[PDB]
Amino acid sequence: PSALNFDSPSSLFESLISPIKTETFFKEFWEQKPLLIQRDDPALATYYGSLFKLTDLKSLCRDVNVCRATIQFHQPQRFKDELWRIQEKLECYFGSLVGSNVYITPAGSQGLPPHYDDVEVFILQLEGEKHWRLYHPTVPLAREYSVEAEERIGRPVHEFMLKPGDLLYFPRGTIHQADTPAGLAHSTHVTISTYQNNSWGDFLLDTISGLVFDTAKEDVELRTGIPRQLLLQVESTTVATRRLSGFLRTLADRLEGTKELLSSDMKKDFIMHRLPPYSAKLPRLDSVVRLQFKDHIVLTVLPDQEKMVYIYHSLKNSRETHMMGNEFHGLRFPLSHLDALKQIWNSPAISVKDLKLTTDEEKESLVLSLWTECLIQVV
């Protein structure tokens, strides 16, 4: 029960934070307060120790980093399978990119100075022990990374010692600092982070375009031009703001009677950069098929590059470049197939004929396209 169960994405997250119940996690901890899970499991401790060892550093020696005294290995999932398998499922579960960093510090040495990150972290102690001290956030759910002055963080709210097998979680903004106790053993943990720039402010901005565009199609006021030279001014004018206020309110109202939101980049960016699935009968129109690798698929309606249904998937993504950000697989379809696509999605199973399409050739053609992209499966 303490071992990681990779059956499903949700089954994995359950085991990762075991014995804490997921229901409890999201209810009292997630994006609220830190959660220390000290364990007593020799097996899990040994498992954890396999995720990344000091020696793994030499075997693989931008990849690493040194902070005066602390060695940081970036995105180990590009080489370590177990982690790739872990973070992959985490991405499916959270629906957000999930990267990780490894921190290695020698005995008796301090680590990075007091600071707070801009992501949700999941710390796993792999080797040795680390002295942690968490402080109250100066910026709850902070959006950017920052270091703070000791004269500002106040006094620790929670202090502890992590050892192999333990797991530490805390929301973005949580000020922290750690050091390796004097002695012989060095410390080694990996920090699995997610939910970066995945707030409502990001969602609002990632959907406001489609809203304005759809609304302006019926409100001539939005289609009206701006004052002359407005862009040449050095200071905004009350009218302009007053005007924009009404427009925001109009948008608001229209939204209530809305059921569609368009992702300008969020969806695309996620699928485009996420990890590929851990990978270490031909359909007829009489067949019964269903989506596979759903947690790796995404769809939206965008211009041709008129408006067509686009299917983006990450089955062909590179794990060697995950999160390194040093650089579009899918399918294009006419709106007429949208509903059909939505049927396939929700339906746990479905017959090719039941597709709400015009003719059987396209009824088949479609499922045949999806099949070549490894998205469809026959029963």
Add this chain to the structure above:
Amino acid sequence: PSALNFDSPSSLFESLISPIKTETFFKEFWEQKPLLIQRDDPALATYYGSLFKLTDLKSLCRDVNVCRATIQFHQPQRFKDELWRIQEKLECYFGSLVGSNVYITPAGSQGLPPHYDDVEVFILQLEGEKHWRLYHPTVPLAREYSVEAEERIGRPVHEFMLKPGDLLYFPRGTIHQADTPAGLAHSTHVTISTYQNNSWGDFLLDTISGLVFDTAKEDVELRTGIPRQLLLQVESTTVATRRLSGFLRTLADRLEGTKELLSSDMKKDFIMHRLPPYSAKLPRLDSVVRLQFKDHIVLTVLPDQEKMVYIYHSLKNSRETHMMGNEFHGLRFPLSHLDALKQIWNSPAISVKDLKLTTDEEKESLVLSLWTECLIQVV
């Protein structure tokens, strides 16, 4: 009085639409209805005929185009000085890009089919005569260009014959079509268009980022994360919309007590692409200086590339590439100089000492920087 007065941008627009008064224009015509200005001025007619001749086509023969029967020369201001001088001032006046196209059609031949443009046009008859027919807009102040079916445009609302010296204006969305009367003479006019994508919907979207960012800095709710897998869904959820509605309303309210709006790209794009000014004593701290080429300057506060005052100008822009869009001059300053910058702007004159800056070296240094960029002038 009918001749074009290039003293100032505003003096030019006045002469362009002469004898119509600008006050009348913006009050009853601009973005409202078409305005036909038939004239009787042999001088102006001859002037107009110089702006672009059939022969100018050969002298310069993506540049041209042929539509079955109609020849379209694109962006003539890249070679014709008078036009460059005209459109430049128009850009200063409108604060929006101002491009132009030339249409040449032989006698007795129809032109493009019925359609409506997505820009504010200013048609100038240069040679010959053209039979015009305007129809009611099917999409008032349309945002995109489109052709319409004769079975839809209804019956002409205004019909006329343009001849050298005349000027025709109509807002975007105004359906139209023209043909060259049978005979000997061909038609030649230039269409000066502006205000493309310069609506409130564009402004809202071009400023919403800075608003959310500034608001989220005090509203933790905006900083809160989105539901898991929200980006993996195929259909929005009432909650999400309801949520976004409140956020829009919050933004609205905050705006009322706001006095600052940030341009994400609008300003930058304008200066970056506009035309350069028509171009065919060293300052001391005791000097009295004032901005020159103001209508060609713009400022905003953006990340370093922390937040610094950026000055962008178009004095070094290429007229040969204007509006061809087949591809950043300015200065960087610390916020501490912003107010000083704003002083220089509003002030019709000002002494270097009066700059609200810390020390005299920077009081001078600043004005010296601006001076090398050709922005400052001494009295």
